[PDB]
Amino acid sequence: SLVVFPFKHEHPEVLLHNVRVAAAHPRVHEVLCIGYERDQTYEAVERAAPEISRATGTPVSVRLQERLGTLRPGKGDGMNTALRYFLEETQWERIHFYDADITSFGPDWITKAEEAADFGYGLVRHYFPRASTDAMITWMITRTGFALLWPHTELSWIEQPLGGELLMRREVAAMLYEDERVRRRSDWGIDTLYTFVTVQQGVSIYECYIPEGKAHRLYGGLDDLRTMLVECFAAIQSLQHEVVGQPAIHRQEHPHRVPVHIAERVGYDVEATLHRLMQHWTPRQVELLELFTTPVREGLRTCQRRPAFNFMDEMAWAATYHVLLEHFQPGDPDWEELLFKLWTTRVLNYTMTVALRGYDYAQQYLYRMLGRYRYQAALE
Amino acid sequence: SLVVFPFKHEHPEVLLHNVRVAAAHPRVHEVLCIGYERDQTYEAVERAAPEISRATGTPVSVRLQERLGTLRPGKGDGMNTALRYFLEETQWERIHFYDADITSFGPDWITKAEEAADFGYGLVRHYFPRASTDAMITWMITRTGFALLWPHTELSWIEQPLGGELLMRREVAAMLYEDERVRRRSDWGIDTLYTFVTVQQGVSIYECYIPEGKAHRLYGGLDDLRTMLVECFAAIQSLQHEVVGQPAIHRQEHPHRVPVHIAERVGYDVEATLHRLMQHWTPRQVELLELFTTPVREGLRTCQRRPAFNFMDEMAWAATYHVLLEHFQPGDPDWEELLFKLWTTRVLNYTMTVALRGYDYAQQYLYRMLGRYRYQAALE
Amino acid sequence: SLVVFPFKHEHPEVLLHNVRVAAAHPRVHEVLCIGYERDQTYEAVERAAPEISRATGTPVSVRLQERLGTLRPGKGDGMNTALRYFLEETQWERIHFYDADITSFGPDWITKAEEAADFGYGLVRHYFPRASTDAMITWMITRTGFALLWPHTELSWIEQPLGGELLMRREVAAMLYEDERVRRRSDWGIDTLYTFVTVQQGVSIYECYIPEGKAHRLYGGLDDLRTMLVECFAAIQSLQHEVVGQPAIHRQEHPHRVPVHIAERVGYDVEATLHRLMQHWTPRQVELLELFTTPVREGLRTCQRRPAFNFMDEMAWAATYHVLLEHFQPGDPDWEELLFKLWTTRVLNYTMTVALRGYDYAQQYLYRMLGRYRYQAALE
Amino acid sequence: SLVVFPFKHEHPEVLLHNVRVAAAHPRVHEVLCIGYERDQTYEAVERAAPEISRATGTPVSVRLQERLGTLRPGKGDGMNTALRYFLEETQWERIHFYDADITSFGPDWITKAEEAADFGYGLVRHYFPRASTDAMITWMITRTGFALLWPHTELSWIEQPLGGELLMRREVAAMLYEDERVRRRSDWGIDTLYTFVTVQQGVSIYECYIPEGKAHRLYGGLDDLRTMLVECFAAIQSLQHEVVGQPAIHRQEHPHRVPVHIAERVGYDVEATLHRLMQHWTPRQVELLELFTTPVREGLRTCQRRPAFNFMDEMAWAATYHVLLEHFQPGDPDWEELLFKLWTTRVLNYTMTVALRGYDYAQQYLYRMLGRYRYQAALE
Numbered sequence A, B, C, D: 001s002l003v004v005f006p007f008k009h010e011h012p013e014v015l016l017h018n019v020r021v022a023a024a025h026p027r028v029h030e031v032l033c034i035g036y037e038r039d040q041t042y043e044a045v046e047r048a049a050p051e052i053s054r055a056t057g058t059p060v061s062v063r064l065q066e067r068l069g070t071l072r073p074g075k076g077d078g079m080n081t082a083l084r085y086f087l088e089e090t091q092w093e094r095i096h097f098y099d100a101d102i103t104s105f106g107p108d109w110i111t112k113a114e115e116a117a118d119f120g121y122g123l124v125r126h127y128f129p130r131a132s133t134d135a136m137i138t139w140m141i142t143r144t145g146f147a148l149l150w151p152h153t154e155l156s157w158i159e160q161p162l163g164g165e166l167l168m169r170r171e172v173a174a175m176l177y178e179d180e181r182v183r184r185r186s187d188w189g190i191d192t193l194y195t196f197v198t199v200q201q202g203v204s205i206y207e208c209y210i211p212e213g214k215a216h217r218l219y220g221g222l223d224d225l226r227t228m229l230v231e232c233f234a235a236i237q238s239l240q241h242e243v244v245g246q247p248a249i250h251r252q253e254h255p256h257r258v259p260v261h262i263a264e265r266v267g268y269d270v271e272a273t274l275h276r277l278m279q280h281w282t283p284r285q286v287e288l289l290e291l292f293t294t295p296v297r298e299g300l301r302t303c304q305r306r307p308a309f310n311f312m313d314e315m316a317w318a319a320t321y322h323v324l325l326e327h328f329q330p331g332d333p334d335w336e337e338l339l340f341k342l343w344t345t346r347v348l349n350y351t352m353t354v355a356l357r358g359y360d361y362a363q364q365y366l367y368r369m370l371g372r373y374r375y376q377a378a379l380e
């Protein structure tokens, strides 16, 4: 197998430790790191690589990403360059991807994926325990979108549709590389696209549970997720007219109880988030709210003077999601700020009325949210 | 819809309460009770029925089961009688079954099933939280069997393959009642057969989670499960050469955290169970053990003098299961007793080495068990 | 024993149920309800009493509170009137108090307190499981005060020093009724005084765990807690030069795991709380902040424009507490509102950075909080 | 401070690690290891001392225990030799003891004990989270005894009265070493004796919570606790007529949630334990049962043929405890075997009816058990 680590700016020791782990693994025949640019990290890996490959007997290489997509040059270009490398320059049967900022990586992850793949699956997705306020794009954006647009499919049931840790066999990789919808998603939307297209093509999927979790880079206020947010949404919007006549085999490793240290952390800075909700207003944003239901429109307007979020419950969010699907303009700064404020209030609402009731309550709640979304969507 | 309660010997007030709940439900058009014989319970329901249907506007009736199968006349004959009544004597589009001895039934259960059916599913199964020592036939016999025999199918993933609580749509009922394999399963094997063939014909299945659990009749020593145990095993064994098939298609409501009162109970009497392990021995049973691996043969023999069960771990059990599949003679008193003792030691082993480590630990274990069994099966 | 229910405004059926429960108890010889005014509730009880007292054989009566203290006529006058009645007009050996608004009251509570009293203890205090956002005056005012001022004593170790549910023996009641420090506490400060002086007097104390919790009247925003906040702080402040001897007998029934329904609730409405933090400002309050450390002064100032609360950790709170003890003027509207805003940020800081982390986490944290406060006070 | 490690037979690397941790600690001035005999361990430590005593600047020495007591030469003689060395040959103000076989020791333990000492306490006891089937002597013998014989005292409230981990100040050590009751307890009984007399003399006690637990040597069947069992019982019996007539001050650090890895282990081998129950019978033992209540007499007699333990609930156990206190003969092999079997059935009972219900349930139970024992004792 080929193992890939896409990296942008990361601590060299962190990624070098992972590369080391993969190279040492009996089933890994090559490690590739795909860089955004020739930085500190790049230089480090390149210097370490020859040594590592000699030590482990398995070749390690670094490359810059190629520009293959048409949106912002980001993670997509990174991953798809790896798909190209894999398909056009190696003979390997399987490719793994793992995010480079992972600090809890172990041979573990590789073994479990390889063993599922031996069982027959086309795509193996790793998924992890999560803190109740983690994964707010995954839930409020990706899984929500999937539930609302494709209720009868397996899409909304994928646990971590955004997750960078996965194993594809060669023909699944070939299919994804050759698809032009995926190819052009050069930005953060890449994972959404891999997820959507493998499901739509009926690839059989296994979700692998990694118990010790995914310990990686942590967030301040919500707005260091802002690009990713707009991009992940734009990805769902771009797919909204797709049909998914059937269907994919899909099994999930049964999850263990969350580790305590993972359940007991806050995924973001509340005070800062509340503050930011009052900032970067624009007469045009105010005007754009004329497109939304009254509670949401009054709701968000209040945010110019003081934080408001009680209004953004489940039902308001679904209403908001439809208006966004239909009017949101990718790349318009006002639409992007508006989507950001809107998602913010959904996350604050959820944090204060649900997450604050406990880990378990908040999981019951998210699952039951998707179900309600699916039911509602199936009804029209 | 038609709602059916199969009853053998139960407290009239318990069943009458359930009937009342069903009849009151806005989506129920008929309630049917299927009795084993004309006993106390039967008489109670028959007297109450005319009154209840007048009170609720939906017809309620009682009938004896018909002899439709060829094994012991038991629950199968009751449920298949209901299928016949449903298909040949009503116009209804959906049939529910619920065990009569349920004391936590509410409109709840009916609504949830009817809603999933509206979504599109062909079979909706109710499943419940469980005490770590509950459902030992489900786990050690039914799900084990499905994992060992059909690893690439959805069979071993069904949560409660013995569950009496389900909704079928008319065409699914028609298909089952027509199937001779199922029709003949007059005994406890019926539920196994419903589970097996619906999966094998690619019916689409939703598992509904009932959070407040299923509070019903409780067990003393393991041996008041003994007929059920031999009959449920016989059912797996009778299907052992089937193939399969289609995919199809299977989704589970996400389970909530187990209620405390359900996690904090012991599902059987350990002392009695150890005692019973030493009883009903037979020279022929001692002989029949010659057919089993050494640790098991030596293990079970010790049980004539004192209780032994540490030998019966996962791998020993799987080995045992294969010898049983291939040599167990349904209806042979020595084979039945032996299966009983064998299974007892497995339950005891699980109780002392797994269940005693906690509710969570014991669930991780059982799920992981089925996975190991599936991996091992797919290896040959 | 005498059982007393102090009431101000409550639902008659709620209180009447409680009175009925007490009157039926084999150990209860008299039930007394102490009212604030002759309202609806009062009239209800007085009509119902003669019956009850006939139905159960134990006398039930209602009286208005007397004016005995010198602060706001509130709960203190209510409870001390009971003490006077108990001592001067009855021969009973033991008095219980229970809040009238309790909806989870049962013979239970009485039995457990009477049995501890039999063991010998002078005072028996009932304590309950709590939601992580409950009891923010208990924690951030009373237990905090106790730790910071009397670190070597048993004070900060009482679980629920504001608790209205307790049993005293006659001599304890006589001691309290005779103390003018307690007598004058006519307002909400009464429970703090009962707690303080029985500890100061080396009364032996037993804390009795009520597992089903105390289900009573719930709160909106934090600010319907305002009068109780300022009067509970005033109480601590009034005691600040007291010296407390050396630790008596104090024993606590071991707490069970919190019930899920109690752990899973939010104890207040976060939006309204953030809003209220920006209201009722005054140029004098702004000036008064010149008395506080820089972080807290700048922190609270920001609240005129947007909610700010991250500055208010543990140590800032302690610092602020010290400034309050020394400068807070009871009865001054600006000091009162200032105290209110200050507490509010302790509570918000704590909800966002600690409660959000889990029920367990937030309890570890509060206990470790008192310990850090004790250590710090001990240090000078 | 002097830190002492008593050792009999242990792995050098385990003990040597702990020695290293103590010596490195800024508050430790001398480390002493007290050995049973000049074995492997002894030789290892003696070789290493020197080296350690020298990379830390704090002297480390080993000695053989002296024969100071009059029972079996065991732990008592070791601990008391340490006391003697401490008092007669050093100037240090405080002595710690830690078990040698601990594998989770860290500077931690010493710091916490030293800081409590600094706060004033005369004895600091470390206590740890436990598996539900751990500590069966502590609960069913020591704490039970304390609760039945001294209900009004602090004795049964000490969390780990057998714990080897504690800090005494010089005067408390002096007092204990001077006490002939403790001096003669040369065997396992020593810890019971330190616990009893420090409480009896009104030494003020702090219990220190060590969250990471005490990882040490594990048990097979219950019978490798057999000498310890009889000696610990003998200890309580020898003290049965003592009077306890003052307050100790007694405070317990609030415990954190049990770590999962500690909650999820089985503390013994059930199958072996059941087998052992049927062994080493004797006509005299059968006779001696004549002294016990009928359920217990008939119950234990069944154990000659098959394991029986349902009879040994709480109340049977208390009854049995009283018969033992009054008739058990230390050093009589039949009384010793009988006590062992009796206690085994108690442990089995608690295991199957209680521990199997969950970690929390089992703790609620043990605490409530002492409660009931205390109430019952206080009633006569």
Ligand SMILES: [Cl-]
Residues within 6 Å of the ligand: A134, A135, A136, A137, A138, A139, A162
């Ligand atoms: Cl996310």
Ligand SMILES: [Cl-]
Residues within 6 Å of the ligand: B134, B135, B136, B137, B138, B139, B162
């Ligand atoms: Cl079962």
Ligand SMILES: [Cl-]
Residues within 6 Å of the ligand: C134, C135, C136, C137, C138, C139, C162
């Ligand atoms: Cl409070």
Ligand SMILES: [Cl-]
Residues within 6 Å of the ligand: D134, D135, D136, D137, D138, D139, D162
């Ligand atoms: Cl022990």
Ligand SMILES: [Mn+2]
Residues within 6 Å of the ligand: A099, A101, A216, A217
């Ligand atoms: Mn990341």
Ligand SMILES: [Mn+2]
Residues within 6 Å of the ligand: B099, B101, B216, B217
């Ligand atoms: Mn049943």
Ligand SMILES: [Mn+2]
Residues within 6 Å of the ligand: C099, C101, C216, C217
């Ligand atoms: Mn109240």
Ligand SMILES: [Mn+2]
Residues within 6 Å of the ligand: D099, D101, D216, D217
């Ligand atoms: Mn040990």
